[PDB]
Design an enzyme around this catalytic site. Structure first.
Site, PDB file in Angstrom:
ATOM      1  N   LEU A  29      16.526  53.624  14.180  1.00  0.00           N
ATOM      2  CA  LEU A  29      17.242  53.297  12.952  1.00  0.00           C
ATOM      3  C   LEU A  29      16.283  53.039  11.771  1.00  0.00           C
ATOM      4  O   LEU A  29      16.589  53.376  10.624  1.00  0.00           O
ATOM      5  CB  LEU A  29      18.157  52.083  13.203  1.00  0.00           C
ATOM      6  N   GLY A  32       9.725  48.186  10.068  1.00  0.00           N
ATOM      7  CA  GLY A  32       8.870  47.485   9.106  1.00  0.00           C
ATOM      8  C   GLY A  32       7.445  47.848   9.481  1.00  0.00           C
ATOM      9  O   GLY A  32       7.212  48.924  10.042  1.00  0.00           O
ATOM     10  N   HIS A  33       6.483  46.970   9.198  1.00  0.00           N
ATOM     11  CA  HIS A  33       5.093  47.236   9.602  1.00  0.00           C
ATOM     12  C   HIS A  33       4.880  46.943  11.062  1.00  0.00           C
ATOM     13  O   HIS A  33       4.248  47.738  11.774  1.00  0.00           O
ATOM     14  CB  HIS A  33       4.093  46.452   8.758  1.00  0.00           C
ATOM     15  N   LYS A  56      16.137  45.090  17.626  1.00  0.00           N
ATOM     16  CA  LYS A  56      14.857  44.953  16.933  1.00  0.00           C
ATOM     17  C   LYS A  56      13.751  44.453  17.853  1.00  0.00           C
ATOM     18  O   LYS A  56      13.873  43.402  18.488  1.00  0.00           O
ATOM     19  CB  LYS A  56      14.987  44.051  15.710  1.00  0.00           C
ATOM     20  N   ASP A 142      12.037  40.620   0.800  1.00  0.00           N
ATOM     21  CA  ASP A 142      12.165  42.058   1.087  1.00  0.00           C
ATOM     22  C   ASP A 142      13.505  42.653   0.652  1.00  0.00           C
ATOM     23  O   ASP A 142      14.003  43.623   1.242  1.00  0.00           O
ATOM     24  CB  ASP A 142      11.942  42.326   2.576  1.00  0.00           C
TER      25      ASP A 142
HETATM   26  C1  LIG Z   1      19.884  53.727   9.021  1.00  0.00           C
HETATM   27  C2  LIG Z   1      19.181  52.369   8.881  1.00  0.00           C
HETATM   28  O1  LIG Z   1      19.093  51.954   7.512  1.00  0.00           O
HETATM   29  C3  LIG Z   1      19.903  51.276   9.622  1.00  0.00           C
HETATM   30  N1  LIG Z   1      21.103  51.377  10.122  1.00  0.00           N
HETATM   31  C4  LIG Z   1      21.450  50.209  10.714  1.00  0.00           C
HETATM   32  C5  LIG Z   1      22.595  49.785  11.398  1.00  0.00           C
HETATM   33  N2  LIG Z   1      22.701  48.574  11.896  1.00  0.00           N
HETATM   34  C6  LIG Z   1      21.698  47.706  11.770  1.00  0.00           C
HETATM   35  N3  LIG Z   1      21.556  46.429  12.192  1.00  0.00           N
HETATM   36  C7  LIG Z   1      20.322  45.932  11.842  1.00  0.00           C
HETATM   37  C8  LIG Z   1      19.648  46.863  11.161  1.00  0.00           C
HETATM   38  C9  LIG Z   1      20.509  48.042  11.087  1.00  0.00           C
HETATM   39  C10 LIG Z   1      20.366  49.322  10.537  1.00  0.00           C
HETATM   40  N4  LIG Z   1      19.390  50.032   9.846  1.00  0.00           N
HETATM   41  C11 LIG Z   1      18.064  49.587   9.401  1.00  0.00           C
HETATM   42  C12 LIG Z   1      18.202  48.325   8.529  1.00  0.00           C
HETATM   43  C13 LIG Z   1      16.815  47.861   8.068  1.00  0.00           C
HETATM   44  C14 LIG Z   1      15.814  47.675   9.219  1.00  0.00           C
HETATM   45  C15 LIG Z   1      14.431  47.367   8.592  1.00  0.00           C
HETATM   46  C16 LIG Z   1      13.497  46.998   9.695  1.00  0.00           C
HETATM   47  N5  LIG Z   1      12.870  46.780  10.634  1.00  0.00           N
HETATM   48  C17 LIG Z   1      15.749  48.905  10.160  1.00  0.00           C
HETATM   49  C18 LIG Z   1      17.155  49.319  10.607  1.00  0.00           C
END
Ligand SMILES: C[C@@H](O)c1nc2cnc3[nH]ccc3c2n1[C@H]1CC[C@H](CC#N)CC1
Length: 293
Positions: A29, A32-33, A56, A142
């Site tokens: 999805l 970060g770093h 995560k 952020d």
């Molecule tokens: C596509 C992407 O922006 C995304 N889709 C998500 C759907 N559900 C989610 N639930 C938590 C994050 C998350 C999601 N993220 C990103 C959102 C920011 C994140 C930044 C970092 N590490 C990475 C996933």
């Protein structure tokens, strides 16, 4: 006499505990770093019916991810991505999965459905999430469109807290040490100059995030693209200094196309060079609400 075992105490099921063996990776999805987030199906029945969750974990720092988890666990707000649990031995944070993904993904694909009115409602919702965070005495550090998740056409949630930090009671800011991977083009001057972070610094960031929302997160319109236009794209390690200069001179990101001046003025109240002169999340809410009536 007989082999002595321990009496098994009746085992409950913690609904916030995800067993690693049942967490099946679907895809990436984002990152970060030091952190990354994957889509997974928690599929304990093994028939692809389990709920989809965002997982995560650390990229190959555990203490910072544990902190992030403690932060997320105790945040209760409709404009904040939901904590679902953890997966332990090492740890993974398990959150709700929002299929529309972030504003970066959703906005460019749904322009036709998303008019100034809906954007202001999102903006309102981002301020309410941030205000709540601010009342918990946290600075986010952020705030950018990539971290604003789309729950539905009518709802966004702040969807990541990798850089979030508590501000001590009876203190106005948090001093950051590790600044290597800062989103400089989202950052207030006090952050870029003295590594200090106020709630007001997040107000600044919101202004830039609002600008992204207003340009539908078009890549050629990003605050990075536009800023590298104003200052020059080939200054390497002098970029940040060149940035701080421009900002000192009073230069800011230009008004997005089809953005009414009145919306742009709320944006610029965010980008007051001095933190004490910046508007507050509650004043922005009042402002936006005014424009929605
Ligand atoms: C596509 C992407 O922006 C995304 N889709 C998500 C759907 N559900 C989610 N639930 C938590 C994050 C998350 C999601 N993220 C990103 C959102 C920011 C994140 C930044 C970092 N590490 C990475 C996933």
């Amino acid at each position: 006499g007989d082999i002595v075992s321990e009496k098994k105490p009746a085992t409950e099921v913690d609904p916030t505990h995800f067993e690693k063996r049942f967490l099946k990776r679907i895809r990436d999805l984002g990152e970060g770093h030091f952190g990354k987030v994957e889509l997974c199906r928690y599929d304990p029945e093994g028939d692809n019916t389990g709920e989809q969750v965002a997982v995560k974990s650390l990229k190959p720092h555990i203490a910072d991810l544990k902190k992030e988890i403690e932060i997320l666990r105790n945040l209760y707000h409709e404009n904040i991505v939901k904590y679902k649990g953890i997966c332990t031995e090492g740890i993974k944070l398990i959150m709700e999965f929002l299929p529309s993904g972030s504003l970066k993904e959703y906005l460019p694909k749904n322009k036709n459905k998303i008019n100034l009115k809906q954007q202001l409602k999102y903006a309102v919702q981002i301020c309410k999430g941030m205000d709540y965070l601010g009342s918990r005495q946290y600075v986010h550090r952020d705030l950018a469109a990539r971290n604003v998740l789309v729950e539905s056409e009518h709802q966004v949630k702040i969807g990541d807290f990798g850089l979030t930090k508590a501000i001590e009671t009876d203190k106005e800011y948090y001093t950051v040490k590790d600044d290597r991977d800062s989103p400089v083009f989202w950052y207030a001057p006090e952050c870029l100059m003295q590594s200090k972070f106020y709630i007001a610094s997040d107000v600044w960031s919101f202004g830039v995030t609002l600008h992204e929302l207003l340009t539908y997160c078009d890549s050629d319109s990003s605050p990075m693209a536009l800023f590298l236009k104003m200052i020059g794209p080939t200054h390497g390690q002098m970029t940040v200094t060149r940035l701080v200069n421009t900002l000192k001179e009073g230069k800011r990101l230009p008004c997005p196309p089809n953005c009414p001046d009145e919306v742009y003025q709320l944006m610029r109240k965010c980008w007051e060079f001095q933190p004490s002169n910046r508007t507050s999340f509650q004043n922005l809410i009042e402002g936006f609400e005014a424009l929605l009536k």
